Amino acid sequence: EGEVTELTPSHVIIGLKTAKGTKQLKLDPSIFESLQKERVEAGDVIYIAVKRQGRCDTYATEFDLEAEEYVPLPKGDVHKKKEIIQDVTLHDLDVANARPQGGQDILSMMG
Amino acid sequence: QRIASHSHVKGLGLDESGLAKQAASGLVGQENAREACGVIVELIKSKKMAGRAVLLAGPPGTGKTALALAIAQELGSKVPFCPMVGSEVYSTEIKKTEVLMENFRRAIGLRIKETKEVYEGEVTELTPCEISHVIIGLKTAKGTKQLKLDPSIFESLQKERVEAGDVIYIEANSGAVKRQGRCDTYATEFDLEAEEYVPLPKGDVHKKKEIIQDVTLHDLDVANARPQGGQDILSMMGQLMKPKKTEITDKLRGEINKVVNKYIDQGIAELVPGVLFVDEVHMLDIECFTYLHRALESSIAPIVIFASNRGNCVIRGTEDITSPHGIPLDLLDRVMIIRTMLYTPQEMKQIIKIRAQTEGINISEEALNHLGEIGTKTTLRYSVQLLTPANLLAKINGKDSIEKEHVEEISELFYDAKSSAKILAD
Amino acid sequence: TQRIASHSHVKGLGLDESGLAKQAASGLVGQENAREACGVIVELIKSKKMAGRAVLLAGPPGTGKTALALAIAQELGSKVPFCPMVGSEVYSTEIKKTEVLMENFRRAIGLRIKETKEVYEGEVTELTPCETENPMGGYGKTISHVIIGLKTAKGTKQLKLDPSIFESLQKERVEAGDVIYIEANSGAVKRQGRCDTYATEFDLEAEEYVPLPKGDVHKKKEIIQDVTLHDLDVANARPQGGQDILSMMGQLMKPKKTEITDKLRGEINKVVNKYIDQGIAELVPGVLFVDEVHMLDIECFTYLHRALESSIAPIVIFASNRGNCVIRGTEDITSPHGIPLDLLDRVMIIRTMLYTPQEMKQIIKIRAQTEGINISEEALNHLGEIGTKTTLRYSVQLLTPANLLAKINGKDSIEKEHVEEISELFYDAKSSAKI
Amino acid sequence: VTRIERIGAHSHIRGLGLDDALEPRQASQGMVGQLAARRAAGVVLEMIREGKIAGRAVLIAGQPGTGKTAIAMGMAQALTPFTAIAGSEIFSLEMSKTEALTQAFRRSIGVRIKEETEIIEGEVVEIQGKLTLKTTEMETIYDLGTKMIESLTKDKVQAGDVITIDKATGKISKLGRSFTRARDYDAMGSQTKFVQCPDGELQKRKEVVHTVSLHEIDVINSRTQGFLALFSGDTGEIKSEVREQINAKVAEWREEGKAEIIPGVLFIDEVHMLDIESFSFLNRALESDMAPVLIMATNRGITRIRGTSYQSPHGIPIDLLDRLLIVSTTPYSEKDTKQILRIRCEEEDVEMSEDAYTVLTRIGLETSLRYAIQLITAASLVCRKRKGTEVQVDDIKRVYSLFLDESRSTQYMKEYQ
Amino acid sequence: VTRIERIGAHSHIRGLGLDDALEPRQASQGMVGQLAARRAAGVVLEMIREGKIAGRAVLIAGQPGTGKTAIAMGMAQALGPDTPFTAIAGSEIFSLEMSKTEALTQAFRRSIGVRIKEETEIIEGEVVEIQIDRPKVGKLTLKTTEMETIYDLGTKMIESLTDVITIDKATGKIQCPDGELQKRKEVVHTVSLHEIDVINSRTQGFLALFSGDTGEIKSEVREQINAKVAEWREEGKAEIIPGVLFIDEVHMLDIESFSFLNRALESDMAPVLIMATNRGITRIRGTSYQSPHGIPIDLLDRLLIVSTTPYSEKDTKQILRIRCEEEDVEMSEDAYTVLTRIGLETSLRYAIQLITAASLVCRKRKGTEVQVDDIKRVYSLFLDESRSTQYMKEYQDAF
Amino acid sequence: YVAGPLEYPSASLILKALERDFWKEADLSMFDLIGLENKITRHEAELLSKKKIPRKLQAPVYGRDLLRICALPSHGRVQWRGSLDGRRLMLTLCRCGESLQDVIDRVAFVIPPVVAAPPSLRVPRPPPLYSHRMRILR
Ligand SMILES: Nc1ncnc2c1ncn2[C@@H]1O[C@H](COP(=O)(O)OP(=O)(O)O)[C@@H](O)[C@H]1O
Ligand SMILES: Nc1ncnc2c1ncn2[C@@H]1O[C@H](COP(=O)(O)OP(=O)(O)O)[C@@H](O)[C@H]1O
Ligand SMILES: Nc1ncnc2c1ncn2[C@@H]1O[C@H](COP(=O)(O)OP(=O)(O)O)[C@@H](O)[C@H]1O
Ligand SMILES: Nc1ncnc2c1ncn2[C@@H]1O[C@H](COP(=O)(O)OP(=O)(O)O)[C@@H](O)[C@H]1O
């Protein structure tokens, strides 16, 4: 998580900035975002297998009226690992592996 | 070889004069049905008639399916033979009539005579000139030359990721494929590329051979029931229903018949009508019999062999109409009925001996007598089934052949339909 | 190709100004009370005041229930829609019965939608009169108006349009000498193509040159489009525009006729009412003629006697031919006309008596006339006699074959001998019952 | 040489042999007996040819093996769209009985459409911005617009290519170069086949007639048309798209002469198996304007109607029986049986003796006729086995002893397994 | 701790209690009685293992609760892995996406295995942060504890170097591994004729693990695959192995399924069809014909019947003790006698239910060993089928 | 939960189970789908404009080449391409019970559930990967 400072590109060397520090991640091309996901001033949170554009960086003072809404700079470190004790049923895994919806290959999306 | 229930049946057993021998080609007795089979097999080999039907009627365990397999073997693999079952008609994604028509079409085969030649060449010599004209080099183990190709072949080639030192096959009319490496990819010591290599091919640079591909009308129908691929229409994913619901006859099957007749008149194709063996015919519905007695009347219907095990009973789907052989009188007529008779105890013992010889089991004289007695007691199939575990136990006990003790023990161990019903009264 | 159908002589109920019945009732003869009831119900339909009303054309076979049905349909005219349906069509393997019934009800209802659009067209002569920069700000170069010289076949008329449209002009290839399709309110420019006057015979191109517009530059095109409510339902059901709908495998199965009540009712009804009360459309409820109603399952009648309760349901004309018979889908549940006794209470029964032998003769004669073949007095009398003996529909079918036999025999009119020979060559089922 | 179609069950009848005045002959076009039924078939055939009316159905009745299907096939061969189906074909899992029956009805009608368009064709000499199109009798230069320039590149048009372009910028490169094929010694492309240079005027208008059935609803059914025209196609066939669009368009084409309809024939063999739903639907479908002439065949007398416990003549409802002209056949006699057996032997290339013919006729009288029709070829094959030149009584007797008939089969069922 | 394969009804059995000569035992491998049926099961198991004969079928008849399915599960366990054993019920064929006949002929496909051996070369290695991202041939530091090979590779191989770098015939794949980097690994894969489905379409292994595939292409992909796997046989490419198809409660099949099985067992690759039925004289489904076991005679004659006699007091208590050993229950001899009585009276499965409930009650009351009072209170709490039937007099919403 | 893909190990000969010998696949010209590129009028034109046998444009090899190149063009057929081309309101709805609202807002407001545990797609793992299947997939 953190405000995107650089988005220069297969592999994309993205730059996330947070209250703690800045880190240049060597992210894979599979995470390359299709929608707007502005190269700068865009707040993004990613986890390993989809990205979520939380909101725009707190530049509310740059313009008096802008369509984008703003959220504060994330205070947590860029790279963080959290253990989640999720409760699921076996049929969930069954039906998921039956017709998976992950991945990025075009064949998957067409299926 | 995994001996099956009808392995010893390697033929029909007719002599030169046409009469059926007492015991030959794996079959025993049943001279009348064997003569009828040897007549209908010649009818089929004539290739002049169409839609003629046959019915191998008779009590159970009389070898009607054995006679059908004997006919199939005598005909040879050069003509199609479609083993079919009544229950198979009850499809979920295709209507019964359509499944029956597809089986009928499968029962017809045609051989396509064609002389194809290749133009294998070296890629390292690739040197186009003008995109309008291109030249490729030839270097095989027996000769080296060069060819001149239409730029379309060059496009189809560059479409593939060709590389210097690869073996590419170029057909004279259309198509092209790549074979990577010619004893030069492993030489540079570069690691694998998810594919296996191959040395340079032997023979002349230009090869020509006669081709004969046995294809049936159903294959043509299935191929024409799809866009053939190519452009964006090539979209194909899992669950694709290749056996589509139905295919119209006038505008699709008719065109197939027309093109086949044209290519036959041109001498390129040769038709070879097959046989459609529908077992358990009584399982078909009356709405299936009514269409069957009409489809076999067409000028393109092949020879259809039938086999009704059970006798007179209520027809399927009616619940009130009863007809002999479980077939309506409408379809029963016009179908040559071949009655199969029961086997005698001596014939049963001879069939048991033939089965033992084919499957490799060795039985003694008294053992053969006891097994034939157990067979004629309930049915021959019970003895045929007990034959194997008898020799199995013999081997377990250290005996090479089967004796009275082993056959009696295995008969007491297992039980038959008659014995089971006798004890089922409890 | 005239392609005379089975019974096309019927042109209308043929009721007098007073509403009574006559013999020569525009093709249909006899059935005085039935035709009077048909007139009453067609007057009802024309009133367009009541909805969800059903009528039953009960009567023995051969009474011409379908005949009078088509007669009342023609009387209604092509203006109001008329959707004919048979009970067998309700049985669908992809869509449930009740939804097919609702779709048919929607089809029976019509809706005329008008659309007036003020559009300007003609050969363009673009020119921007230079104007002083925005007077509120500083100086420079601006454009306060953009004049377009639309030239039509009748003359020329320059339009001083708003300058903001200049973006649209530059967007499309709007060059001096082409036909543009201007819109009054929207203003969007849609170039039709260059003028044919410049289409030199040596220029190889198509769909690019169009003829000059005929008439004044300013044209107020008024167009009316009549589409049933079911058409709007289907149009709003499936999607359109991108979204990877171009796929073949997973999308070619267009038969998704399954429909929900939320979309059918609710929003569609509201937008229809908005177009009605606003002056953009006019509702036109039609009629749903359902013959062989006895063929429907009880699950169909139980939904019919609930849909007829709705205010939007159109007029339904049931035509049952069978008598007291067990309702389909029920266990030996005998009801009159093969219809549950509960639905018969919601339908007006129009009884149709059997045709008098004189009426049989009249029908045979008028059918022969419609066919265009002359028949002698003796031949017509024999036809009437045989139609009295067996079903009447057998006689009318003996006209064309007898006509052809006569024409092949060298004679024009159908002589008694011809009909006598055809009666032995072809006969009815009553005589065929002798197995 | 063996072909797809060969001698079958109804191939001996080349047509409905009739005179100019519809006087059935004894036996001319392979068909014999059934004089009244033959004259009725000829009358209904003339009615079909006339096309003056619509919605006429004929029921062919008679006992099994009386030549009903034979008369139907003879009428079909003498009759030009023809659609022969059975009661089980309309029964589809993905299409309701009504939908399949409507599809069959619409496919039983033909429609001819005349198309006239301007065509420009000639060998391309060189392009560019402008085309230089050559033909045998002249050559012309054409200026290329943006669309033409784009089509010249999306399709690799080049010198020598015999191009073709009508209006609507619909360019076509039918086949490749003419002379340049020489330097293409070894390999020749799949689509790059060669053609002769065209002649005559460069630009020429060609009038062509397109023959299609009224079942074209499938063409206007979905976004893709050619795909559904091969396999089952679409199953919905919405009533609107069928009636409000196709029928109106055909009527407008008839008015303006763009198209002309030709009503065919719909032969539903073994109609007795149809359900009451199909009969109730037909009751109305036969009332429509564009309704073809319907023909039926049934071997049932007083039997139950499938789908209900009711019984009626021919196993069909009375509502429909009042709409059909019943043409019952008569069982063949000794002379008619012998003559049809003679015709079958002549068609199957089988020669038999007079005593053989007499015995075969006696069998066909004591048993069914198809039994003897099969005994013909069976005894022929037996004689071929014996290498004889003509089939004698011994062969037919041997076959009669080998292959059993319904009667003898049932009589020998005393075993009861 | 808690695994998926928890303690079940047929979990106590872990094999077939036979000697070298297929001689049954009184108590071994969780098997107590059914000596004749156990010997027949062993004989048919050895026959299956031979694999030289094809197209045979067997039927395990007997009253409910007489070890019908226990013998089948014991045979399955004795067969061990490496041999397909398709265990299904008579209700599985009734599928919607596929016809019942197609479902059955596909279940047959799941009962025939084929072993294929692939010889490939796999290289060792370890990830040391090779193939850095954005921040030519490159560099590959291939090294092993036994011997190192520091060399480079082409451009299409440096981008697939990356903890253990197990490079194989593919485009690369992932303490440092020991031994020479070049190592020949012979891997053998066993598939149950998956070629018919694994080569049905594109992206079809998806279907092989989804069953979304509708009725297979009849006589177009099943016969060609059979011919090709036969060509593989006798040429050293592959060899087929016959499995077993167990259809529990086969009486649910209809006349169509029986007629199809009649001829499905007459093919070269026909597996051994073992079946089981509790019903006796019963009408065949779809018809009114009353036949023994609900199976037609034309099929019963094609198979061997295997009867299972009921258990006695000795065998009853021995099976009870075996189940106790399987579970963690312990009781006194008096409790054993009482439970054996209750079982021989009502049923063995109900006796196992009662002993489980008694162990639970004992654990609840802080007891260490179940007693007679525990099982008595259990029987009082949990009623028997026959017991509840007697109380049916209350007329609780009859039909 | 992001569950890992289920590896499906399988033999390599499995993927080569429907491949036929290159010297046995004959040229099947029975494909009637050629009606997507040819017309009936153009079909007739080609038939009426087929080059003759002489074709006056190593000697025996060249003669055989000319013969084989004359044999193939003789094949001509078409089902229909011209007859197909020769023949030919999106109102706003609320999609719910709310009075008036942007459909985008409707869809964006109510999205509680997310997939429980969607994994990636299954991947067969035959240690040998035949060039044919990989090329077709690429
Ligand atoms: N004439 C014969 N000679 C030798 N064996 C025979 C003969 N007829 C039948 N059999 C054997 O008897 C068995 C009967 O099998 P099948 O033909 O299926 O019986 P059905 O007559 O019920 O079809 C076959 O396995 C076959 O091996
Ligand atoms: N009053 C009438 N005048 C003229 N023709 C009639 C009359 N009544 C019935 N017909 C004829 O009867 C035939 C069919 O009648 P129809 O409406 O189908 O009655 P039903 O449906 O009860 O059989 C039509 O072809 C029509 O020509
Ligand atoms: N008049 C006839 N002329 C020629 N062949 C006939 C004649 N009548 C019957 N046949 C022959 O009888 C055979 C079977 O008759 P079929 O048409 O099945 O009777 P049905 O009309 O009851 O179905 C056909 O193969 C046909 O060749
Ligand atoms: N000889 C035996 N040895 C061990 N356990 C047995 C034996 N016979 C039966 N059982 C057990 O007794 C119960 C009998 O049920 P089972 O035979 O599976 O019923 P069915 O076969 O009718 O479904 C099962 O729990 C089984 O494990």
Curated annotation (Swiss-Prot), chain A:
Q: Give GO BP annotations, semicolon-separated.
A: box C/D snoRNP assembly; cell division; chromatin remodeling; DNA recombination; DNA repair; positive regulation of canonical Wnt signaling pathway; positive regulation of DNA repair; positive regulation of DNA-templated transcription
Position of the Glycyl lysine isopeptide (Lys-Gly) (interchain with G-Cter in SUMO2) cross-link: K75
* Subcellular localization, as worded in the UniProt entry: Nucleus matrix; Nucleus, Nucleoplasm; Cytoplasm; Membrane
Organ and tissue specificity = Ubiquitously expressed with high expression in heart, skeletal muscle and testis.
GO CC terms in record: centrosome; ciliary basal body; cytosol; dynein axonemal particle; extracellular exosome; Ino80 complex; membrane; MLL1 complex
Q: What UniProt keywords apply to this chain's record, in alphabetical order?
A: Acetylation, Activator, ATP-binding, Cell cycle, Cell division, Chromatin regulator, Cytoplasm, Cytoskeleton, DNA damage, DNA recombination, DNA repair, Growth regulation, Helicase, Hydrolase, Isopeptide bond, Membrane, Mitosis, Nucleotide-binding, Nucleus, Transcription, Transcription regulation, Ubl conjugation
Among the GO molecular function terms of this UniProt record, one is:
ATP hydrolysis activity
Between which residues do disulfide bridges form? none
Locate residues linked as Glycyl lysine isopeptide (Lys-Gly) (interchain with G-Cter in SUMO1): K75
The main place the protein resides is: nucleus
Question: Quick check: keyword ATP-binding in the entry?
Answer: yes
Q: What is known of its domains?
A: Binding to MYC is dependent on a Myc domain essential for oncogenic activity.
Query: Any remaining note in the record?
Result: High level of autoantibodies against RUVBL1 are detected in sera of patients with autoimmune diseases such as polymyositis/dermatomyosistis and autoimmune hepatitis.
Q: Which family does it belong to?
A: Belongs to the RuvB family.
Q: What is this protein called?
A: RuvB-like 1
- Originating organism: Homo sapiens (Human)
The lineage, from the top, is:
Eukaryota, Metazoa, Chordata, Craniata, Vertebrata
Q: Which residues of the full protein are shown?
A: 132 to 261 of 456
UniProtKB/Swiss-Prot annotation, chain B:
Q: Where is this cross-link: Glycyl lysine isopeptide (Lys-Gly) (interchain with G-Cter in SUMO1)?
A: K202
- InterPro entries membership: AAA+_ATPase (IPR003593), P-loop_NTPase (IPR027417), RuvB-like (IPR027238), RuvB-like_C (IPR041048), RuvBL1/2_DNA/RNA_bd_dom (IPR042487), TIP49_P-loop (IPR010339)
Question: Position of cross-link Glycyl lysine isopeptide (Lys-Gly) (interchain with G-Cter in SUMO2)?
Answer: K202, K422
Q: Name the reaction it catalyses.
A: ATP + H2O = ADP + phosphate + H(+)
Instruction: List UniProt keywords, sorted A-Z.
Output: Acetylation, Activator, ATP-binding, Cell cycle, Cell division, Chromatin regulator, Cytoplasm, Cytoskeleton, DNA damage, DNA recombination, DNA repair, Growth regulation, Helicase, Hydrolase, Isopeptide bond, Membrane, Mitosis, Nucleotide-binding, Nucleus, Transcription, Transcription regulation, Ubl conjugation
Q: Please provide, in alphabetical order, the Gene Ontology terms of the cellular component aspect for this entry.
A: centrosome; ciliary basal body; cytosol; dynein axonemal particle; extracellular exosome; Ino80 complex; membrane; MLL1 complex
List positions binding ATP. G58, P59, P60, G61, T62, G63, K64, T65
Enzyme Commission number, as recorded:
3.6.4.12
Q: Which GO terms describe its molecular function?
A: ADP binding; ATP binding; ATP hydrolysis activity; ATPase binding; cadherin binding; DNA helicase activity; TBP-class protein binding; TFIID-class transcription factor complex binding
A Pfam family (short name) is: TIP49
Q: What class of enzyme is it?
A: hydrolase
Subcellular location(s): the record lists:
Nucleus matrix; Nucleus, Nucleoplasm; Cytoplasm; Membrane
Could you mention a single GO BP entry for this protein?
A: cell division
The protein's matches in Gene3D superfamilies, at most eight in alphabetical order, are given as: 1.10.8.60, P-loop containing nucleotide triphosphate hydrolases, RuvB-like helicase, domain II
Q: In which tissues is it expressed?
A: Ubiquitously expressed with high expression in heart, skeletal muscle and testis.
Instruction: Spell out the family assignment given in the record's similarity comment.
Output: Belongs to the RuvB family.
Q: State the domain notes.
A: Binding to MYC is dependent on a Myc domain essential for oncogenic activity.
From Swiss-Prot, chain C:
Where it sits in the cell: the answer is: Nucleus matrix; Nucleus, Nucleoplasm; Cytoplasm; Membrane
Which key words are in the record?
A: Acetylation, Activator, ATP-binding, Cell cycle, Cell division, Chromatin regulator, Cytoplasm, Cytoskeleton, DNA damage, DNA recombination, DNA repair, Growth regulation, Helicase, Hydrolase, Isopeptide bond, Membrane, Mitosis, Nucleotide-binding, Nucleus, Transcription, Transcription regulation, Ubl conjugation
Q: Which InterPro entries match?
A: AAA+_ATPase, P-loop_NTPase, RuvB-like, RuvB-like_C, RuvBL1/2_DNA/RNA_bd_dom, TIP49_P-loop
Gene Ontology biological process: box C/D snoRNP assembly; cell division; chromatin remodeling; DNA recombination; DNA repair; positive regulation of canonical Wnt signaling pathway; positive regulation of DNA repair; positive regulation of DNA-templated transcription
The entry sums up its family as follows: Belongs to the RuvB family.
List the protein's name: RuvB-like 1
Designated gene of the protein = RUVBL1
Curated annotation (Swiss-Prot), chain F:
Q: What is the covered span of the full protein?
A: 1383 to 1862 of 3159
Expression sites (tissue/organ)? Ubiquitously expressed.
Q: How does it assemble?
A: Component of the NuA4 histone acetyltransferase complex which contains the catalytic subunit KAT5/TIP60 and the subunits EP400, TRRAP/PAF400, BRD8/SMAP, EPC1, DMAP1/DNMAP1, RUVBL1/TIP49, RUVBL2, ING3, actin, ACTL6A/BAF53A, MORF4L1/MRG15, MORF4L2/MRGX, MRGBP, YEATS4/GAS41, VPS72/YL1 and MEAF6. May also participate in the formation of NuA4 related complexes which lack the KAT5/TIP60 catalytic subunit, but which include the SWI/SNF related protein SRCAP. The NuA4 complex interacts with MYC and the adenovirus E1A protein. EP400 interacts with TRRAP, RUVBL1 and RUVBL2.
Query: What is this protein called in UniProt?
Result: E1A-binding protein p400
Chain segments annotated as coiled-coil in the UniProt record: none
Organismal lineage: Eukaryota, Metazoa, Chordata, Craniata, Vertebrata
Q: Where does this polypeptide localize?
A: Nucleus
Source organism per entry reads Homo sapiens
Q: Which domain of life is it from?
A: Eukaryota
The text of the family note is: Belongs to the SNF2/RAD54 helicase family. SWR1 subfamily.
**What function does this protein fulfil?**
Component of the NuA4 histone acetyltransferase complex which is involved in transcriptional activation of select genes principally by acetylation of nucleosomal histones H4 and H2A. This modification may both alter nucleosome - DNA interactions and promote interaction of the modified histones with other proteins which positively regulate transcription. May be required for transcriptional activation of E2F1 and MYC target genes during cellular proliferation.
